[PDB]
């Protein structure tokens, strides 16, 4: 991928982890039905106050080694090409050709 794109991922994840404490304890008020609409509205408007890419939903899953949005495996953490290369070279334990 691009250097700017890769830096965007770390910049988003850092601010998402830093503000994770506020996001959960702020959406808790919204989720709590037993609350006043005056505090519900305040919580709703205060959540849009923090910077946008501060949520886990606003980040992608580019592969660590190279960087590729389309094509990824959560268990392996790399794109399809890199996963195949690692499997063929033996870097992934207990991974062989499936044939049933």
């Amino acid at each position: 991928a691009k250097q700017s794109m890769k830096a965007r991922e770390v910049k988003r994840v850092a601010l998402a982890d830093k503000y994770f404490a506020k996001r959960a304890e702020l959406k808790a008020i919204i989720s709590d039905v037993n609350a006043s609409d005056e505090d519900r509205w305040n919580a709703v408007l205060k959540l849009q106050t923090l910077p946008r890419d501060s949520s886990p939903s606003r980040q992608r899953n580019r592969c660590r080694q190279t960087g590729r949005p389309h094509g990824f495996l959560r268990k392996f953490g790399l794109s399809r090409i890199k996963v195949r290369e690692a499997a063929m070279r033996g870097e992934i334990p207990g991974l062989k050709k499936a044939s049933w």
Binding site: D37, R40, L45, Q48
Partner: protein
């Protein structure tokens, strides 16, 4: 549509503009890039120059539109004619 638990969704900077427009002196249109902000009765009468992608288009707000997004009254792409309407 959005769940009624969270209620209407508007921009934070939009509330300040709406308050300043009604209090006091509205002569210039309210310039907002936000289109997801729901319309409120406070904005009735006031001019909203809503951005659609190229340039802000003026929208005159009446009581008919309340439970609709402000971006609905803003075409995204210009249409003139498919058969080369010159």
């Amino acid at each position: 549509p959005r769940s009624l638990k969270k209620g209407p969704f508007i921009d934070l900077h939009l509330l300040k503009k709406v308050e300043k427009a009604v209090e006091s002196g509205d002569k210039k249109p309210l310039r907002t890039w936000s289109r997801r902000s729901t319309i409120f009765p406070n904005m009735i009468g006031l001019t909203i120059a809503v951005h659609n992608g190229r340039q802000h288009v003026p929208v005159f707000v009446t009581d008919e539109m309340v439970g609709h997004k402000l971006g609905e009254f803003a075409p995204t792409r210009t249409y003139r004619g498919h058969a080369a309407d010159k």
